[PDB]
Design a protein around this ligand. Structure first.
Ligand SMILES: Nc1ncnc2c1ncn2[C@@H]1O[C@H](COP(=O)(O)OP(=O)(O)O)[C@@H](O)[C@H]1O
Ligand SMILES: Nc1ncnc2c1ncn2[C@@H]1O[C@H](COP(=O)(O)OP(=O)(O)O)[C@@H](O)[C@H]1O
Ligand SMILES: Nc1ncnc2c1ncn2[C@@H]1O[C@H](COP(=O)(O)OP(=O)(O)O)[C@@H](O)[C@H]1O
Ligand SMILES: Nc1ncnc2c1ncn2[C@@H]1O[C@H](COP(=O)(O)OP(=O)(O)O)[C@@H](O)[C@H]1O
Lengths: 415, 144, 65, 435, 427, 440
């Protein structure tokens, strides 16, 4: 019923609502207004899909809450799967097991995919009989269209003796390695037998990132990325030769790289040492086209008393493109609230919509989006069906906001 | 091997000074890990009960079409590692069991049944006096 | 048959210790058997009469130089 | 033992309005009727990442309401009480604690079926074969129902050897985990020897081969840490837990991604059931600016649970910035993502009835005169101080031979013990004498 | 035996009556009636242990008996009740966080005593037979009242051979596990009497029934439980340096299982005291955690000794009384200690000198009280042993006024060294 | 080898039988008020009665704190342990600050332990069983004793042992004509190979043939161990051996101190008492010399007067060099001597006076005598004069280079011109400071 993923803060966003010529619609695919910044997002998405001019940075500026993250989520959705879209917060680089610069270059590598094609042959049928003559034997597999015998060699007999697989089990046998996998006991876990041919060649493609390759080629069974046991790979010894070997895979017909996308949220958390590394990491061939956002203006840079836009030094500020987002009006706010209500199961009245739009233009946009569900549930408390203005007023009274909670501080608390 | 440890190294005999330098009483002052096991056996048995809410297979396996020399070398590596350390890790099996699974401590059998408490109190006195009891039930399952 | 019984007793006051070979008294000596004391001596070489330090594998004669 | 037990629910009417005196909670009616909507949202299993900020002066029930929220949802849904000081970990990244707590607040009830082998072992003949390792092992278990022979892998025989078991004893075997325990020798052989170190357990009942379904309830953080720090039986990988056993940092592709995919595979096939939790981060006002900034992406996640913060400060300098201040000690960017809930400062009558409620909790019989004098002593001090001169008062009354508490008892206990405000003037007077 | 006396070894407990009425100079505690009565009340609250999560602070001038009252409470509490004394600066560890250190300190003062009724045997070994080839044997045990013969089994024989006991030894046989614990030797000796051997020692044989049901008890702290349960490193809870407990997978499980044990009656509770001396060292985060750490049934009471006044809180720039924020200070009630008067300091010095086994003349007491009232009490107490050495060096009997006056000029207390610090040594 | 140090001249406090300091004795000169003050604490240490006492050697730099501080270790002698440490050794990367203090506190408390054990050595000539006349039923004779003949350089004697010793011998797999090792107190029997004297030829096997053991077959000699509480603590903390895989972790550095107090109140700290009261060990409380104490952090200072209040703690001899200085780790605090007022209230301060020209001259003479320099009376006078200007350190350091210049210039005694030439090649702190202030 309820999956691990539920209705979050960016579920309505299904992608960029652009036309064939990168012209944003008034409201489409869950994106309201934001024409200029949305079309700029479209341009960057197109030049990413192109994947020729690498090493480009963009900064989505604007007032707090002006869909700066919505644009990034829409770009991610439009880019679709099969293309790495790495999203991390500016605070995630501050790690104790690895240095901030190492974490940053690690995220960079994670934001670059490598496309490799395989031509393995996979078997898929059901076991009829398994034999063992203490050693050699025979194996009879069955599918809905045919049955056949198989000579159980050393590897096969050993693997099938180690595994508990027996007669009457739909299984798969990768003739390359011999990995046995049972998808269900029998006819009705139980599951029916497969159809078509028993042994058939299957093409497999893996979009492994340079990070995965490095972790695979660093230690004995070095695939410890699952828990990031590694504190940092050996730069220029196991990290530069992997690049040369990937270039060898390319321009030969072995593999092709897939330019990913990086989205560092709240970049103002990055210190001066992280910005210094970006000034040179974005000048290499294998560098993704990253985007970033910051709600602060000319604030202090973490590390010194210097004041600079976005809290980012000038040396990096003159190295990226800024994308400012304008404030929303009544129309845009109301349409965003309506799309948010459509995402959920709530259905507000027209007067309720106007009241919520006024409340969201008074204090802030996110406050109305939050009060949506509160009023929806308060309506269900009085045994109603539609969220009326009275419910929104009751909620506005119950739940306070930033600006109204700050003004209520006429009683001194701790400090 | 013992640089400044309070107990002496292997003494091949009395001819070398190193024998008449470390007292056995001082040797009893330092407890080896297995001696700590012998000391703590009681609380090890009666206080180690926690278990991981989830236990996944050890390896984070990796599907592939790998080269033929990798899997055999890894198998030989595991064989080498296992044949050596497991004989030395046997002493920790006792705790690995308690940490692995948890069964009733047999104290609840009497606690969760009042009539068994009076039965325990009675049989105790009857055995202290030297009697022999015949316990009758209608139920056979109750005999278990 | 092969029974070796260790018996400790509280004699009178004082604790003694006996180990009896119930199988057969001969096993009382079978276990502490042997006593082959060593009787080697230096095999002076025949050439220079020096204390031998080696044994030629070919001649088997002990030599020193 | 009771420290915060007086709270046992929000004490709300069917219409959400807070029942003035109910569930051991009195006062803060607005805050409680608001937390009613919060608990209703949590039980809906529809939203994710919604945050709440219980703001108010010290000792205003924000934590009381937070625990009453847990008491309202029951013990079925996961609840993770966390303090803001747990993020400053030295053995692992700071954001790692936040992400693993967000993952740990998500429950997962997964019904599972497993088989069990048990009974009195008759014989164990390890099938020998040339490789020259032992091929298999035939074990015969005799129970009250019948006796059956079964073949197991060599690992189970090795485990049995670890147990130092023999022929004719009772054993417990599990094919899922592979762990084999030693319950003891069979009970019928108690007359064999005079005295032995073996324990005797009755012949296990039921069929030798028996299964049973277990409805287990765990969290996603459990699977995360199990896949990040694997474990198993008879595998040397356990060495990782001896030389490479620091706190783990599950990568994004593991914390998210594959774990969520396998959990969804379990759910959509009718084996698992999702249950959101409540992450009560108390004393959030002292988190680092980095934690506050990461909370942005943490809450906006579609997996994040309903969070209920609890601030105490009015307006102080944000920790980690050292130069900028904001309300509640929380930056404004995060404060826009929370539904702040007020908490009214208690009035004389509310405080008096709170003292009354707290008194009858830990078995204290306080007289009306002493109760009223506690109100006078409290209006000059904080509620938390006036509500604590009850156990010392009861202990002192037990000494004076009086079964109840009188005026003199609480007057002498109010004299032996001072409070923050009354003790601060004592230091202000003797300024250059305390060091 | 040999554990030299310390600065706080003289107090053997609060000098209180059955009604928590502090006596003037009983049981080593001199004066300080109000603070002693408060400490007695909190101790009576401790030996009851029906409420957990409270705190009490002892403040006053430096050298007024805060740590003295703490040690007195610790002593009057006696064993069988965990008491943990920690300085505020001890939690600043490098292998664990501050909150982790605080959790460990708290859980180190919560004891779980599991009562185990294990039946065993106890008697003097008279004869043992063991037939080595499986091997089989017998055993005969004697007590003052009766004797019997045992037909040992294979595993019992193995255990007795590992212990290798012999006739005359007094041992205890655990019927459940078979562990053989030998208390000594009875009146028996001379294995051969012709071979070498150490001196012989004998002890009386056990009395009463040979087999008897006794009661063992295993008392461990909650911290030790969470520790040995933290990871599979064998024989933990000593391990010389390392605790990395996990919050949920271990801690919550330990709490739940202890509650379950209390439910059925295996080990209910025995709360303790956590005396945190010099708590002003704790960081703002430590207080932030302590705020909610006391809000738990497993949170034992803590006692804090403070010497600071209106001073900034460490880790920040917030001025607050006692160097403690008003958030944590809201729970704990404070106790005031009055500076000792002339007759109080004099009697304190008298008791502290009678503790060190030194005799001082009547005028020695007067001059030392003069010094300890113009100067600090700790310096007057330190001058008790220093003056007691020159007297012995001159083959004296009891400390005179001249010896004290000489040792006073030999040393400087706090002011005669700073007043002479007029040479601009280094800064 | 001597390897003359900077403090190899102080042999003791130089106090007479009445406790009065001589003007010049045992290498030390002057500082009578201080050498008599720090002499009482020597008897305090020799009493083994008090615990946690502290004395603060507070004076200007170079007055002699370290001079008469380590001289107490000479008066006390090497028998009692003496653990010196500078205030900068507390800061560590693998052990918390407040813990190094405790680790050093227990390293100063010594515990000497004595044990007596008989010993047997010599070539075993024969091992014949002693017959027991059918103790059980008619199965066979029994070994009541075993007659063993051990040969040594002194003589050969036959001895009886128990039947359990016979079983141990049989399972030990030894033969006759070899050297064995028996300890009757414990019973364990060890082997020392065969007898190199007659048993081995020129063969190659390094069986470690022990020569015919020289001495009586039976010998006893009390072993006297000198273990500290910190040594036994680390031993119980970092076990050794080649078993119990937990101990097999010899690849890791394992510097992991911070001994939990559970292991203190439990093991060795308890078995120490059980051995002392038993009459096996004698506690030897030592000294804990902590110089440059002003380097300790505020946390360290706070923990100091919590560990000093424990019944198990040694004396402490602080050496504070700073005047009124800011405490390290805090702000706007001007505690005197760089030590918090609270801690200064617990220490007995011994004020050392400033040396006069004649006392510095005596010190220079003594240091020259120690280094072995044949300084003349004119060179000595000029050194004293130029040392009255600067500190004593620079003055007394101009003996080695001056002696080198002398030897190079065909001399056997430092002359007036040698120290003058060296005084120009090298200068003191004030001169360099003036030269720096004159330049940029
Ligand atoms: N173009 C848009 N279409 C739909 N919803 C939007 C749009 N822009 C903003 N929003 C809504 O307004 C809110 C703005 O918050 P957000 O963009 O996350 O702030 P920030 O970018 O500063 O982190 C989002 O929760 C989003 O749902
Ligand atoms: N609604 C309430 N009913 C009864 N007592 C309350 C209530 N709210 C707070 N208290 C009392 O106040 C004390 C501290 O409250 P707490 O939850 O710590 O507030 P805060 O989180 O603001 O410090 C508790 O001991 C409790 O008895
Ligand atoms: N009530 C008391 N009875 C006897 N001696 C006391 C008492 N209070 C303090 N002292 C003496 O004062 C000395 C130091 O007191 P201390 O515990 O440091 O006080 P504070 O904790 O206020 O610093 C101790 O050596 C002790 O002998
Ligand atoms: N009483 C003394 N007798 C002889 N030499 C002394 C004496 N006091 C100091 N010195 C000399 O002064 C030198 C420096 O003194 P030192 O003790 O290191 O200074 P401080 O202890 O003040 O740091 C030493 O090398 C020592 O030779």
């Amino acid at each position: 019923v309820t999956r691990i993923e539920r209705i979050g803060a960016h579920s309505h966003i299904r992608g960029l609502g652009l036309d064939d010529a990168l012209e944003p619609r008034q409201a489409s695919q869950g994106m309201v207004g934001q024409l200029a910044a949305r079309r700029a997002a479209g341009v960057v998405l197109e030049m990413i899909r192109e994947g020729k001019i690498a090493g480009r940075a963009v900064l989505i500026a604007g007032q707090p809450g002006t869909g700066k993250t919505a644009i990034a989520m829409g770009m991610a959705q439009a880019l679709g799967p099969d293309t790495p879209f790495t999203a991390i917060a500016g605070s995630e680089i501050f790690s104790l097991e690895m240095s901030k610069t190492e974490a940053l270059t690690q995220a960079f590598r994670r934001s670059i995919g490598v496309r490799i094609k395989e031509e393995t042959e996979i078997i898929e049928g059901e076991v009829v009989e398994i034999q063992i003559d203490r050693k050699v034997g025979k194996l009879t597999l069955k599918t809905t269209e045919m049955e056949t015998i198989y000579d159980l060699g050393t590897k096969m007999i050993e693997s099938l003796t180690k595994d508990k697989v027996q007669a009457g089990d739909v299984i798969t046998i990768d003739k390359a390695t011999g990995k046995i996998s049972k998808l269900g006991r029998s006819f009705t876990k139980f599951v029916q037998c497969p159809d078509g041919e028993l042994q058939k060649r299957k093409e497999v493609v893996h979009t492994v990132s340079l990070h995965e390759i490095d972790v695979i080629n660093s230690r004995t069974q070095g695939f410890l990325a699952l828990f990031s046991g590694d504190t940092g790979e050996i730069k220029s010894e196991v990290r530069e030769q992997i690049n040369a070997k990937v270039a060898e895979w390319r321009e030969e017909g072995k593999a092709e790289i897939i330019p990913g996308v990086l989205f560092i949220d709240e970049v103002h958390m990055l210190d001066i040492e992280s910005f210094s590394f970006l000034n040179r990491a974005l000048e290499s061939d294998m560098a993704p086209v990253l985007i970033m956002a910051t709600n602060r203006g000319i604030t202090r840079i973490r590390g010194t008393s210097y004041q600079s836009p976005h809290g980012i030094p000038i040396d990096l500020l003159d190295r990226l493109l800024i994308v400012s987002t304008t404030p929303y009006s009544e129309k845009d706010t109301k349409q965003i609230l309506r799309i948010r209500c459509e995402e959920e199961d709530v259905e507000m009245s027209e007067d309720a919509y106007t009241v919520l739009t006024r409340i969201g233009l008074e204090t802030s946009l996110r406050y109305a989006i939050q009060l949506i569900t509160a009023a929806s549930l308060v309506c269900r408390k009085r045994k109603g069906t539609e969220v009326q203005v009275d419910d929104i007023k009751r909620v506005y009274s119950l739940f306070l906001d930033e600006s109204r909670s700050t003004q209520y501080m006429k009683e001194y608390q701790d400090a | 091997q013992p640089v400044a440890s309070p107990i002496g190294p292997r003494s091949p005999g009395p001819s070398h000074p190193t024998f008449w330098t470390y007292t056995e009483a001082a040797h009893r002052a330092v407890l080896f890990p297995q001696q700590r096991l012998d000391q703590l056996s009681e609380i090890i048995e009666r206080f180690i009960f926690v278990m991981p809410p989830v236990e996944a297979p050890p390896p984070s396996l990796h599907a592939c079409h790998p080269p033929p020399w990798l899997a055999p070398r890894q198998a030989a590596f595991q064989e080498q590692l296992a044949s050596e350390l497991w004989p030395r890790a046997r002493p920790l099996h006792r705790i690995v069991c308690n940490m692995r699974t948890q069964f009733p401590d047999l104290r609840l059998i009497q606690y969760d049944c009042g009539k068994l408490q009076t039965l325990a109190v009675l049989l105790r006195q009857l055995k202290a006096e030297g009697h022999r009891v015949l316990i009758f039930t209608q139920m056979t399952r109750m005999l278990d | 048959g092969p029974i070796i019984t260790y018996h400790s007793v509280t004699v009178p006051r004082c604790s003694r210790t006996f180990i009896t070979f119930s199988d057969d008294a001969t096993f009382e000596e079978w276990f502490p058997q042997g006593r082959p004391p060593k009787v080697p001596v230096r095999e002076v070489c025949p050439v220079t009469h020096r204390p031998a330090l080696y044994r030629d594998p070919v001649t088997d004669i002990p030599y020193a130089t | 033992i009771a420290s915060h037990s007086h709270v046992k629910g929000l004490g709300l009417d069917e219409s959400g309005l807070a029942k003035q005196a109910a569930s051991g909670l009195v006062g803060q009616e607005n805050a409680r009727e608001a937390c009613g909507v919060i608990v209703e949202l949590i039980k809906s299993k529809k939203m994710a990442g919604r945050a709440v900020l219980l703001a108010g002066p010290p000792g205003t029930g924000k934590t009381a309401l937070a625990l009453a929220i847990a008491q309202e949802l029951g013990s079925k849904v996961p609840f993770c009480p966390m303090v803001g000081s747990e993020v400053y970990s030295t053995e692992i990244k700071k954001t790692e604690v936040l992400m693993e707590n967000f993952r740990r607040a998500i429950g997962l009830r997964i019904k599972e079926t497993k088989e069990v082998y048990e009974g009195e072992v008759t014989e164990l003949t390890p099938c020998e074969t040339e490789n020259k390792t032992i091929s298999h092992v035939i074990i015969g278990l005799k129970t009250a129902k019948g006796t059956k022979q079964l073949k197991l892998d060599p690992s189970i025989f090795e485990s049995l050897q670890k147990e130092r078991v023999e022929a004719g004893d009772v054993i417990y075997i599990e094919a899922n985990s592979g762990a084999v325990k030693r319950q003891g020798r069979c009970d019928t052989y108690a007359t064999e020897f005079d005295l032995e170190a073996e324990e005797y357990v009755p012949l296990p009942k039921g069929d030798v081969h028996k299964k049973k379904e277990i409805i287990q309830d765990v969290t996603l953080h459990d699977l995360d840490v199990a896949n990040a720090r694997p474990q198993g039986g008879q595998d040397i990988l356990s060495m990782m837990g001896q030389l490479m056993k620091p706190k783990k940092t599950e990568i994004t592709d593991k914390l998210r991604g594959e774990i969520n995919k396998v959990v969804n595979k379990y759910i959509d096939q009718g084996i698992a059931e999702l249950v959101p939790g409540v992450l009560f981060v108390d004393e959030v006002h002292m988190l680092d600016i980095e934690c506050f900034t990461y909370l942005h992406r943490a809450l906006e996640s579609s997996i994040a649970p309903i969070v209920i913060f609890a601030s105490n400060r009015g307006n102080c300098v944000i920790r980690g910035t050292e130069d900028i201040t904001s309300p509640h000690g929380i930056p404004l960017d995060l404060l826009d993502r929370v539904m702040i809930i007020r908490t009214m400062l208690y009035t004389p009558q509310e405080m008096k009835q709170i003292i009354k409620i707290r008194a009858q909790t830990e078995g204290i019989n306080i007289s009306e005169e002493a109760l009223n004098h506690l109100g006078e002593i409290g209006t000059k001090t904080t509620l938390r101080y006036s509500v604590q001169l009850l156990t010392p008062a009861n202990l002192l009354a037990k000494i004076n031979g009086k079964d109840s508490i009188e005026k003199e008892h609480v007057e002498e206990i109010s004299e032996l013990f001072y409070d923050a405000k009354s003790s601060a003037k004592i230091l202000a007077d003797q300024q250059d004498k305390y060091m």
